[PDB]
């Protein structure tokens, strides 16, 4: 069955990115929408929107490609997963690509990046890495 | 995979089975 | 398997209302009838292992449904167990 | 800035392609309709691409550059040959020797030998040796001139390559890609758009469509040589 919706979202993104698709659709949830917001604000995707599906709602994500058809996402990894979950204190927040990437962290103040969490002095669950 | 490994294993197995056959009554009487 | 009239009668008897067929009560009752029929059949054909596997599958499904009904509401579980003459 | 109109190449049959079975899924961008089991190429993309191809050819030849005309399929042989002759540009029509562009230094010796044998013909040394040797020499002359028709003007390298039916001449496109020379091609519905830089969607199996495209490119290079 489906165990990790977040990992499934990340793999849909990765598979669409590798195939140079301009569009990826998935079932909607608040967590997926929030990490989509973080991705868009960090400039990793072009834009996203939510339609309505036959049963629930869908998530529509536009992938960003450069003028020479070069992908704007180099990698997407799921860090904390069902089973072995990962939590980081405000001081040992992970660095992605030596700071060139973004680590999404679920803190009690919402979804933040590693730099935002470090600035606000909070910890939480390390959802994923983007670079 | 090469059949050489199967040949080594089969020769070991064949020799062991021959040994078991040769001492069936002796094993039965000692056990 | 059961004919349409047997299914209709069992569903009318054990169903929660006059339309439901997927309630755990109705499913468990139908499974119990099917299992009894299969047991009678296998009492004659002892070497029908292929049908016995289907019997095992039905038994497992009924056990899972009863587990769900017990977890949801114990009173319904007790009522169903006493009404259908089951042990566990 | 289109020399030909939207009816010109349509009449030739530019919208024709190949069967749906032998199509390339990467060409769904320029595919407009499938009819009678064959794919119909949208011509609007063809126009908005041939204008850019014309512009690139103009800026390349105007800045002291040359283009190389490639076509080997019998449908588009005489067309490219006559266009290259009438604009005085290199061309290949018989057969692409594997490695003209990559192995340029070696194949230039063939042109040197052809010139030497033309000089020998001019001096008249057909009787000074054995008849078998002179016969074999004449055969070598014919083979070298026949296989290298438009190659006698290769000084440095072709600054661009114009090719018909990239599937047929995959070696030439691969050589350009290895060297990095830009390639301008008319891609059919079974071709790969990832290998060409300046595609012009259309049919190549028709003599008339390929002829019309060669007319267009020849006009571009001719006017560019006019504006040196």
């Amino acid at each position: 069955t489906m165990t990790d919706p977040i990992a499934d979202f990340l793999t849909r993104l990765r598979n669409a990115n590798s195939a140079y698709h301009d569009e990826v659709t998935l079932p909607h949830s608040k967590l997926k929408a929030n990490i989509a917001e973080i991705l868009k604000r960090e400039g990793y995707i072009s834009d996203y929107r939510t339609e309505d599906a036959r049963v629930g709602k869908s998530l529509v994500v536009q992938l960003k490609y450069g003028p020479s058809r070069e992908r704007s996402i180099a990698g997407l990894r799921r860090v904390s997963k069902p089973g072995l979950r990962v939590y980081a204190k405000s001081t040992n927040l992970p660095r992605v690509l030596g700071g060139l990437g973004v680590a999404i962290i679920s803190t009690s103040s919402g979804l933040l990046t590693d730099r935002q969490a470090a600035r606000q002095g909070v910890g939480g669950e390390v959802l994923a890495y983007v670079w | 995979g090469s059949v050489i490994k199967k040949r080594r294993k089969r020769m070991s197995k064949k020799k062991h089975r021959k040994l078991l056959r040769r001492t069936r009554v002796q094993r039965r009487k000692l056990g | 398997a059961l004919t349409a009239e047997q299914k209709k009668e069992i569903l009318g008897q054990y169903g929660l209302h006059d339309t439901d067929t997927g309630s755990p009560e109705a499913q468990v009752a139908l499974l119990t009838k099917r299992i009894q029929d299969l047991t009678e059949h296998l009492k004659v054909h002892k070497h029908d292992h292929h049908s016995r596997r289907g019997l095992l599958l039905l038994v497992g499904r009924r056990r899972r449904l009863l587990k769900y009904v017990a977890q949801v509401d114990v009173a319904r579980y007790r009522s169903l167990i006493e009404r259908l003459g089951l042990r566990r | 800035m289109a020399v030909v109109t939207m009816k010109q190449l349509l009449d030739s049959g530019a919208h024709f392609g190949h069967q749906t079975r032998r199509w390339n899924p990467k060409m769904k961008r320029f595919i407009f309709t499938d009819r009678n089991g064959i794919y119909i190429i949208d011509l609007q993309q063809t126009l908005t691409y041939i204008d850019k191809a014309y512009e690139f050819v103009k800026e390349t030849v105007a800045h002291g550059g040359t283009v190389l005309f490639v076509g080997t399929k019998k449908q588009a042989q005489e067309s490219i040959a006559e266009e290259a002759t009438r604009v005085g540009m290199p061309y290949v029509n018989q057969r692409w020797l594997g490695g003209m562009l990559t192995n340029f230094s070696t194949v230039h010796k063939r042109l040197q030998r052809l010139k030497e044998l033309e000089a020998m013909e001019q001096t008249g040394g057909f009787e000074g040796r054995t008849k078998k040797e002179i016969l074999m020499l004449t055969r070598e002359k014919n083979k070298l001139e026949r296989s290298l028709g438009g190659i006698r003007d290769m000084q440095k390298v072709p600054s661009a390559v114009w090719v018909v039916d990239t599937n047929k001449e995959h070696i030439a496109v691969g050589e350009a890609r290895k060297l990095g020379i830009p390639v301008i091609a008319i891609l059919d519905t079974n071709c790969d758009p990832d290998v060409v830089d300046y595609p012009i969607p259309g049919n190549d199996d028709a003599i008339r469509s390929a002829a019309l495209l060669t007319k267009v490119i020849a006009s571009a290079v001719a006017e560019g040589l006019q504006a040196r």
Binding site: E42, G43, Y44, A74, L97, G98, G99, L100 | - | - | -
Partner: protein
């Protein structure tokens, strides 16, 4: 001025009816020590000739390493064939820390301070290929900011910006 590193010479042989025919293959690294490197693999019947072909092939294929001052931009891991080489930037004055093939490639490329480890397929050719694959995975911060359409400060940590400032001042 070009520096060269002949990292390995191997005597290969093919069998014929008469016997064995031995040739030589040399893997050569060519760089300028300023950020560009090239890898060549030449083969000939004589060692100097094979070295010459390797040198010309390495010079033909050149590739620029995204250095930042004296080290690479960020940690990378490159894999080619079964060879795995990991690279990690180091503070100035650390020096090159790598095995022979990786050390040759990095010193040719002009990297001065880096932590490099080989994690599989000790074969020199494949280790060199993996090192080149890792070096080809590096991204300059300006290109990263361009990809995401953000200012250079919103993408990179302040330490990288300070390092770039000091390097360009020097």
């Amino acid at each position: 001025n070009y520096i060269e590193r002949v990292v390995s010479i191997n005597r290969v042989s093919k069998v014929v009816k008469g016997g064995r025919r031995f040739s030589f293959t040399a893997l050569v690294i060519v760089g300028d020590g300023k950020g560009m490197v090239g890898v060549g693999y030449g083969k000939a019947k004589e060692v100097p000739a094979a070295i010459a072909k390797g040198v010309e092939e390495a010079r033909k294929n050149f590739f620029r390493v995204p250095l930042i001052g004296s080290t690479i931009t960020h940690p990378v891991q490159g894999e080619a064939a079964a060879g795995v080489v990991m690279l990690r930037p180091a503070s100035p004055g650390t020096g090159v820390i790598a095995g022979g093939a990786a050390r040759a490639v990095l010193e040719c490329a002009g990297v001065h301070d880096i932590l490099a480890k080989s994690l599989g397929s000790d074969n020199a050719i494949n280790v060199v290929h993996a090192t080149v694959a890792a070096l080809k995975l590096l991204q300059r911060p300006e290109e990263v900011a361009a990809r995401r359409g953000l200012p250079i400060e919103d993408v990179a940590p302040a330490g990288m910006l300070k390092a770039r400032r000091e390097s360009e001042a020097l």
